[PDB]
Amino acid sequence: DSLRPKLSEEQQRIIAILLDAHHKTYDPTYSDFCQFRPPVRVNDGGGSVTLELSQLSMLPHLADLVSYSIQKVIGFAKMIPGFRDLTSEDQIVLLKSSAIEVIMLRSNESFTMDDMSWTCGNQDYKYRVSDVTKAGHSLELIEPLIKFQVGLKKLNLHEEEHVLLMAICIVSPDRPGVQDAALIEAIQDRLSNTLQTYIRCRHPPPGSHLLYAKMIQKLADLRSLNEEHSKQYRCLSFQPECSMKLTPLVLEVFG
Numbered sequence: 001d002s003l004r005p006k007l008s009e010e011q012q013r014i015i016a017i018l019l020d021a022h023h024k025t026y027d028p029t030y031s032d033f034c035q036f037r038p039p040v041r042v043n044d045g046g047g048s049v050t051l052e053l054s055q056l057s058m059l060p061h062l063a064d065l066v067s068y069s070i071q072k073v074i075g076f077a078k079m080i081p082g083f084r085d086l087t088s089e090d091q092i093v094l095l096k097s098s099a100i101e102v103i104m105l106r107s108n109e110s111f112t113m114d115d116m117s118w119t120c121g122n123q124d125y126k127y128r129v130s131d132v133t134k135a136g137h138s139l140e141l142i143e144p145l146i147k148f149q150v151g152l153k154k155l156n157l158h159e160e161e162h163v164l165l166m167a168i169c170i171v172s173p174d175r176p177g178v179q180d181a182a183l184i185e186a187i188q189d190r191l192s193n194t195l196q197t198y199i200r201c202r203h204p205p206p207g208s209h210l211l212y213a214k215m216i217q218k219l220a221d222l223r224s225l226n227e228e229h230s231k232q233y234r235c236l237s238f239q240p241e242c243s244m245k246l247t248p249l250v251l252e253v254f255g
């Protein structure tokens with residue numbers, strides 16, 4: 001063929017709602033960042049696990065940034081068509097297991113290939129590999145995280161595809177501990193069908209009909225980064241007085 005059905009009225013509403021949800025929960029001016037505990041950058045040119053763990057100089061700032069981001073994700077998820085139809089128990093399972101992956105996805109909007117930084121930013125609010133090691137993380141997370149960001153940037157997603165990919169990430173029927181996997185799968189399928197149809201209808205050439213499979217592959221990549229973050233957060237958590245440098249929400253979500 002191959003067939004290019006038009007977006008239904010419902011799929012059109014779904015996309016409008018997700019776009020609106022993202023515009024209300026993602027500030028592209030980063031104007032709240034001055035409210036976070038300030039960034040501190042110690043002398044660590046090369047760049048010492050002992051010193052990084054001793055000082056955790058960027059952790060209060062980046063933990064506030066991540067906590068703030070988790071709050072925005074909860075807000076976004078609440079607006080996903082169908083999410084509120086789930087049990088409060090399943091909503092929380094989905095939120096806590098996807099939070100770090102959605103933060104990695106939504107952070108792509110501040111990421112720039114100009115210098116491979118998340119520029120929120122300023123100079124104070126520009127985050128590089130070395131800022132992330134100053135928060136207690138190691139290259140086994142950071143280097144594939146940068147690779148992931150570049151790979152995602154190069155998909156050149158429409159904002160519609162970006163918000164759908166975040167929604168699909170969150171409403172995933174295979175997360176540990178979900179009860180109503182069938183309901184979650186139904187909601188995800190509706191979103192996935194919307195995304196597939198959108199790409200067919202609206203995405204030039206085509207056939208860049210590998211775009212959907214490239215997007216699904218990013219979801220698998222995110223599971224990997226999630227396991228590695230979990231390992232590294234555990235070792236950060238062993239640092240005496242680390243909990244003062246985090247926040248209640250971060251402690252709960254990642255504990």
Ligand SMILES: C[C@H](CCCC(C)(C)O)[C@H]1CC[C@@H]2C(/C=C/C3=C[C@@H](O)[C@H](CCCO)[C@H](O)C3)=CCC[C@@]21C
Pocket residue numbers: 025026027028030059062063066069072103104106107108109110111118120127128132135229233250
């Ligand atoms: C693995 C890290 C998170 C976990 C850190 C922790 C200390 C909790 O383990 C990194 C993931 C990316 C993260 C990062 C920027 C993330 C952003 C996400 C968005 O929510 C922000 C939107 C703000 C408006 O709503 C903005 O795009 C920046 C920079 C430098 C590495 C990290 C701190």
